Write an enzyme that holds these catalytic residues in place. Structure first.
Site, PDB file in Angstrom:
ATOM      1  N   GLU A   1      -6.060   9.011 -13.438  1.00 15.67           N
ATOM      2  CA  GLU A   1      -4.842   9.224 -14.186  1.00 15.67           C
ATOM      3  C   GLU A   1      -3.983   7.993 -13.971  1.00 15.67           C
ATOM      4  O   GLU A   1      -3.432   7.811 -12.905  1.00 15.67           O
ATOM      5  CB  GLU A   1      -4.258  10.536 -13.670  1.00 15.67           C
ATOM      6  CG  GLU A   1      -2.947  10.939 -14.323  1.00 15.67           C
ATOM      7  CD  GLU A   1      -2.743  12.458 -14.225  1.00 15.67           C
ATOM      8  OE1 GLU A   1      -3.025  13.050 -13.157  1.00 15.67           O
ATOM      9  OE2 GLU A   1      -2.302  13.059 -15.232  1.00 15.67           O
ATOM     10  N   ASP A   2      -4.086   7.045 -14.894  1.00 23.16           N
ATOM     11  CA  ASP A   2      -3.584   5.725 -14.874  1.00 23.16           C
ATOM     12  C   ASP A   2      -3.891   4.993 -13.597  1.00 23.16           C
ATOM     13  O   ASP A   2      -3.104   4.160 -13.153  1.00 23.16           O
ATOM     14  CB  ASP A   2      -2.170   5.671 -15.254  1.00 23.16           C
ATOM     15  CG  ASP A   2      -1.794   5.835 -16.649  1.00 23.16           C
ATOM     16  OD1 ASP A   2      -2.369   5.091 -17.468  1.00 23.16           O
ATOM     17  OD2 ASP A   2      -0.968   6.711 -16.981  1.00 23.16           O
ATOM     18  N   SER A   3      -5.007   5.232 -12.937  1.00 18.66           N
ATOM     19  CA  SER A   3      -5.348   4.487 -11.736  1.00 18.66           C
ATOM     20  C   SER A   3      -6.594   3.661 -11.981  1.00 18.66           C
ATOM     21  O   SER A   3      -7.236   3.793 -13.014  1.00 18.66           O
ATOM     22  CB  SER A   3      -5.393   5.446 -10.563  1.00 18.66           C
ATOM     23  OG  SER A   3      -5.649   4.746  -9.380  1.00 18.66           O
TER      24      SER A   3
END
Ligand SMILES: [Zn+2]
Ligand SMILES: [Zn+2]
Lengths: 115, 59, 225, 258, 47, 66, 39, 71
Positions: free
Chosen positions: C34-36
Site C-alpha cells: 500500500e504505496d510501499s
RNA sequence: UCGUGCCUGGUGUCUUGG
C-alpha cells in the site's frame, strides 16, 4: 540510526541457542524446532528433505518475521518415529547428498579441464 | 570515570576493529560513538583499548 | 534511460536526480502492499540510492555591551560558570571543531563564552543528527567580527521508511529490504532493485510508468537512450 | 526414506563464469545452493579504512565505500583466514586480515586516475584483480590534490554486505519447457525459447506432465573476479554442508540434553 | 605549542593564527580561511 | 559523481569499463556495440555505463591550488 | 613463402551476429557527457 | 611586500586579477594606459588559457572529443 | 590525603509533509 548491525543474521548472541525443540501438544508425535540465526537457506532444504520421509505425516517451516532472524520447523511423524529422529535423518542424508554432489562436481571439473 | 571522552578501539567481539569515542562509562561498560556508522553502542569496558590522539615534539 | 527531448535544455543529463533501477511490479511478500516499495539490500550495500546529507552551522561574535563580550574559546570547568554536560574537548583551543572529527547528537560545535565569570554560550550539534564535520571556514562579517561556518555530513544509507518516488507520481516508503539471495530473479540473475505493489497502477492509471519500464528495457538492450 | 543421488555436467568453463547442470535433486536443494553462492560463500574484501589525508573532490566515506566494493583475489587464502571477530589479536593479524595501502599525490599537470593499481597489498596473493583490461577507477585527482590511506581486508560473506558476494550473476533455471506448469502463460506463443529448450520451433511449451518433479537445474555462475567461477561452487557446497554439520551438532546437544 | 594552522581560501597558503588576530591571509589580503584536517584517528568501515 | 564500482543489481564490476567505454566512443561505435564489446550481457550492467553521468570531470575544474 | 589470403582463411577451424544495435529507430537518440567546452 | 614577487595567476586568483585589469583599462582616459592594459591582459589570458588546456590535457581532453562527436 | 552539578530563547512569516 536504529538499523540492526548486519552481523545479526548469522552471529549468535550470548545466551541464545542455535536450535530448540518443543513438543507440540495439539497432536501426538509433533515437535517444533526453532532455529536461531537462520533463514530460508537452511530451512527450505530441511523441509524438502523431510517430505521424502514416508514416515512423516507433516513437515514445514516458517519465518515468523523477516526482521527477526529465526525459523520454526514443525515435524509430525508416525507413532513409531520421533520427529527428533526425522529431523536428524533429514540433516544426515542431506549432508550425504551435498558431499556426494561436491565430490561429483570436482571430477566434472577436472574432466572439463583438458578432457 | 577517567576514559570518558577518549578515543578507543573495539578489540573483541562482533565490532572488532571499529574506532569510536567514549560518550559515557561505568564500572563494567562504556557507551561508544562508532566513528563510521551513525550509531552509539554499549559495550563491556574490557573489549576496548585506548588509542589516543597526540602529537609529539611540540617545538 | 528514457528521456524527453526537452530535458536536454533543462540540463538534466548533466545534473540528474535519480537512478535507473530494475523495477519489478509484483505483490512480493506483502511489504510493498500500500504505496510501499521493497528495495534490494545488496543493491543498497553497493551504493544504490546512498546519499550525503550536509547540515551547516553559523556563529559570530559581538560586542554585547560595555561589560558584555563574546569570544571564540574553549570553555573550562573552572571559570565558565554556565556549562553543559557535554564533551568540550572534541574542539581545539580555537574554540572550533576541526574538519574530519566525528560528532554525535548534542556534541559541542563552536565553543563560545560571554563575560559576566564567563557564561557559556556555545553552539551544539542538533539533537539526533550524527554526522562528520566536512569543512570549517572562518572569516570576518560586515561588522568586522570573527565569523565561522561549519558543515557536517551524514552518510544517509537508504533505510526502512525512506521515501522513494517515480517519474510518474508513484510515491512510496521503503517497506522492507531483502538481500539478493531473497529477491526474485529472472532466467539470469537479474533481481529487481525495487519491487512496487501492482495495486498502485489500476486506480491511478499511470500507464506511462509501465511504458517507461518497457522502453527502458529496450534502451538498455539496444544500448541507446 | 533417504537422499537422492545428483549428477553434474559442466557445459561451459571459463575464467569468468561456469555453466553446469545438476540432475536428480530437489528444488529446494537446487535453490539453497543459489542462495549460498550469493550470500554465504566467504571472500576477502576491504572492510577497514583509515584515511590519513584526503583532498580529493569526493567525501571521506565515498573513498572508503568504493574501496569496499573492489574485488580481491581470494581463492588460495580465504579458506585459511579467521573471521575478524574470531581472531585472538587485539587489532589485526596476518591470520585474520590482509593490509592495504594507498598513497597518491597528483604533482603533474594532467589529471590522476586513482586506479586499483595504487592499492598496495602486504600479501602478494590477496591483490585487486590486475594479474592478467583497465583498472577500477577510485578517484580522479587534480594538480595538488592527494589521497593517503591504509586499509585492511578481512573475511566475510554477502549476508553482511554485498561487498563479500563473489558472484556477478547466478543464472538459475529449471524445466525450460513448461512441463510442470509452474508458470502459466496467458499466450504461450508470445514467449521466446529458453537457452535450454529441448523443443522444436513448432510447439510453444511442452505438454503437461502430471506426475513429475523438477530435475535438471541449469546454472550459470559468473565470478566478480574475487574467486574462480568454479571455486565459488565448491565453496558454496562446503558452506552449506558446514552449516548443516553445525546444525547437527547443536541438534545432538539438544536431544541428549532433554 | 600549536599555533592553529589555517589555509587561505584564495592563496591556498598555510597561515599561523592565534587568538585576538585578524583573519587575513599573510600572502594577500583575502578574508576567508579554512581549518586543515584533524589529527585524530579517522577510520571507516568500507560499508 | 564517478562510475559505480559494481552494477547495483547483479554486482558485476563496471568500474574499470568507463575509460574503455569512452575510448570505444572515440572510435565511431554505437553505444550498443560499445557495451557489447566490453562484454556487458545483462540489461542491468548495460544501464550503468549508458546512464552514468560523469560529474567528477566538472568537480575537477574547481582547483584547490594551481 | 608462396601463400594467399584465400589460403590463410583456411588455416582456421571456425571463426567466421546481433546487428540491430545500429538501427535508425527515429524515436531513439544518443547520449551526452561532461566536456569542458560548451555554451 | 608579499603580494609582489610570487607567480600570481594559478589557480583562482587570475580571474579576479583579469577583472581588475579590465577595470584599470576602463578607468583610464589615457590611450597609453589602455593599450598597456590591453597588452597585459592578452598576455595573462594566453598564459592562463595554456594552463587550463594543460590541466585538461589528459582525461578531460578525451571526454571533450567524445562529446563533440556524439552530438 | 580529596566531594561541586539541569542548564536551555520569545516573536512572526514563507516552503514543504499525510
Ligand atoms: Zn587477528
Ligand atoms: Zn548488471
Amino acid at each position: 540510526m536504529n538499523a540492526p548491525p548486519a552481523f545479526e543474521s548469522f552471529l549468535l548472541f550470548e545466551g541464545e541457542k542455535k536450535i530448540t525443540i518443543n513438543k507440540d501438544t495439539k497432536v501426538p508425535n509433533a515437535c517444533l524446532f526453532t532455529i536461531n540465526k537462520e533463514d530460508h537457506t537452511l530451512g527450505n532444504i530441511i523441509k524438502s528433505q523431510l517430505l521424502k520421509d514416508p514416515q512423516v505425516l507433516f513437515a514445514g517451516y516458517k519465518v515468523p518475521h523477516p526482521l527477526e532472524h529465526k525459523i520454526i520447523i514443525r515435524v509430525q511423524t508416525t507413532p513409531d518415529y520421533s520427529p527428533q529422529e526425522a529431523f536428524t535423518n533429514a540433516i544426515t542424508d542431506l549432508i550425504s547428498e551435498l558431499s556426494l554432489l561436491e565430490e561429483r562436481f570436482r571430477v566434472a571439473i577436472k574432466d572439463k579441464q583438458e578432457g | 570515570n577517567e576514559l570518558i571522552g577518549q578515543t578507543v578501539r573495539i578489540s573483541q567481539g562482533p565490532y572488532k576493529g571499529y574506532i569510536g569515542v567514549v560518550k559515557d562509562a561505568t564500572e563494567s561498560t562504556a557507551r561508544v560513538e562508532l566513528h563510521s556508522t551513525c550509531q552509539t553502542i554499549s559495550v563491556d569496558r574490557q573489549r576496548l583499548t585506548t588509542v589516543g590522539s597526540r602529537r609529539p615534539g611540540g617545538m | 534511460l528514457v528521456t524527453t527531448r526537452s530535458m536536454e535544455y533543462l540540463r538534466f543529463r548533466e545534473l540528474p536526480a535519480g537512478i535507473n533501477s530494475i523495477v519489478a511490479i509484483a505483490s512480493y511478500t506483502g511489504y510493498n502492499q500500500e504505496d510501499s516499495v521493497i528495495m534490494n539490500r545488496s543493491a543498497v550495500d553497493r551504493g544504490f540510492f546512498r546519499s550525503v546529507f550536509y547540515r551547516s552551522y553559523k556563529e559570530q561574535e559581538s560586542k554585547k555591551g560595555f561589560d558584555q563580550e563574546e569570544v571564540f574559546e574553549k570553555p573550562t570547568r573552572e571559570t565558565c560558570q554556565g556549562m553543559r554536560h557535554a564533551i568540550y574537548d572534541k574542539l581545539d583551543d580555537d574554540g572550533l571543531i576541526a574538519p574530519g572529527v566525528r560528532v554525535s547528537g548534542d556534541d559541542v560545535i563552536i565553543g563560545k563564552t560571554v563575560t559576566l565569570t564567563k557564561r557559556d554560550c556555545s553552539t551544539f550539534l542538533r539533537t539526533s543528527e550524527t554526522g562528520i564535520v566536512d569543512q570549517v571556514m572562518v572569516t570576518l562579517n560586515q561588522e568586522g567580527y570573527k565569523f565561522c561556518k561549519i558543515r557536517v555530513r551524514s552518510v544517509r544509507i537508504p533505510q526502512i521508511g525512506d521515501k522513494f518516488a517515480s517519474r510518474h507520481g508513484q510515491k512510496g516508503t521503503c517497506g522492507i529490504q531483502y538481500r539478493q539471495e531473497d529477491m526474485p530473479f529472472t532466467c539470469e540473475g537479474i533481481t529487481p532493485d525495487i519491487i512496487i505493489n501492482p495495486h498502485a497502477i489500476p486506480s491511478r492509471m499511470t500507464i506511462g510508468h509501465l511504458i517507461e519500464c518497457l522502453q527502458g528495457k529496450v534502451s538498455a538492450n539496444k544500448g541507446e537512450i | 526414506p533417504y537422499a537422492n543421488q545428483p549428477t553434474v555436467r559442466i557445459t561451459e568453463l571459463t575464467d569468468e563464469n561456469v555453466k553446469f547442470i545438476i540432475e536428480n535433486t530437489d528444488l529446494a536443494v537446487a535453490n539453497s545452493i543459489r542462495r549460498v553462492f550469493i550470500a554465504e560463500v566467504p571472500i576477502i574484501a576491504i572492510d577497514w579504512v583509515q584515511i590519513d589525508a584526503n583532498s580529493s573532490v569526493l567525501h571521506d566515506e565515498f573513498i572508503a565505500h568504493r574501496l569496499g566494493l573492489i574485488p580481491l583475489t581470494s581463492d588460495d587464502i580465504v579458506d585459511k583466514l579467521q573471521y575478524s571477530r574470531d581472531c585472538t589479536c587485539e587489532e589485526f593479524c596476518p591470520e585474520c586480515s590482509v593490509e592495504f595501502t594507498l598513497d597518491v599525490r597528483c604533482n603533474e599537470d594532467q589529471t590522476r586516475h586513482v586506479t586499483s593499481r595504487d592499492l598496495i597489498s602486504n600479501s602478494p596473493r590477496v591483490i585487486p584483480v590486475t594479474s592478467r583490461q583497465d583498472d577500477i577507477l577510485i578517484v580522479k585527482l587534480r594538480k595538488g590534490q592527494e589521497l593517503r590511506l591504509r586499509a585492511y581486508a578481512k573475511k566475510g560473506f554477502g549476508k553482511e554486505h554485498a561487498k563479500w558476494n563473489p558472484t556477478a550473476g547466478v543464472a538459475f533455471e529449471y524445466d525450460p519447457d513448461n512441463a510442470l506448469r509452474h508458470t502459466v502463460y496467458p499466450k504461450p506463443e508470445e514467449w521466446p525459447k529458453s537457452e535450454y529448450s529441448e523443443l522444436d520451433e513448432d510447439e510453444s511449451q511442452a505438454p503437461y506432465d502430471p506426475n513429475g518433479k523438477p530435475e535438471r537445474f541449469y546454472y550459470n555462475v559468473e565470478s566478480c573476479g574475487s574467486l574462480r567461477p568454479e571455486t565459488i561452487v565448491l565453496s558454496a557446497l562446503s558452506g552449506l554442508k558446514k552449516k548443516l554439520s553445525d546444525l547437527q551438532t547443536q541438534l545432538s546437544h539438544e536431544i541428549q540434553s532433554d | 605549542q600549536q599555533p592553529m594552522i589555517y589555509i587561505c581560501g584564495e592563496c591556498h597558503t598555510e597561515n599561523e593564527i592565534k587568538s585576538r588576530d585578524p583573519i587575513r591571509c599573510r600572502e594577500c589580503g583575502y578574508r576567508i580561511m579554512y581549518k586543515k584536517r584533524t589529527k585524530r584517528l579517522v577510520v571507516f568501515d568500507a560499508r | 559523481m564517478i562510475i559505480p564500482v559494481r552494477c547495483f543489481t547483479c554486482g558485476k564490476i563496471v568500474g574499470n569499463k568507463w575509460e574503455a567505454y569512452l575510448g570505444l566512443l572515440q572510435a565511431e561505435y554505437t553505444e550498443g556495440d560499445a557495451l557489447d564489446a566490453l562484454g556487458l550481457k545483462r540489461y542491468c550492467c548495460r544501464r550503468m555505463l549508458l546512464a552514468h553521468v560523469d560529474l567528477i570531470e566538472k568537480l575537477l575544474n574547481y582547483a584547490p591550488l594551481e | 613463402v608462396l601463400l594467399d589470403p584465400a589460403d590463410e582463411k583456411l588455416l582456421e577451424e571456425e571463426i567466421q551476429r546481433s546487428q540491430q544495435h545500429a538501427k535508425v529507430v527515429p524515436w531513439m537518440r544518443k547520449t551526452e557527457y561532461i566536456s569542458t567546452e560548451f555554451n | 611586500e608579499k603580494e609582489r614577487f610570487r607567480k600570481a595567476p594559478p589557480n583562482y586568483a587570475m580571474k579576479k586579477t583579469q577583472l581588475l585589469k579590465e577595470k584599470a583599462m576602463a578607468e583610464d582616459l589615457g590611450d597609453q594606459d589602455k593599450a598597456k592594459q590591453i597588452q597585459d591582459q592578452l598576455n595573462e589570458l594566453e598564459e592562463r588559457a595554456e594552463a587550463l588546456d594543460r590541466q585538461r590535457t589528459k582525461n578531460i581532453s578525451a571526454i571533450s572529443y567524445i562529446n563533440q562527436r556524439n552530438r
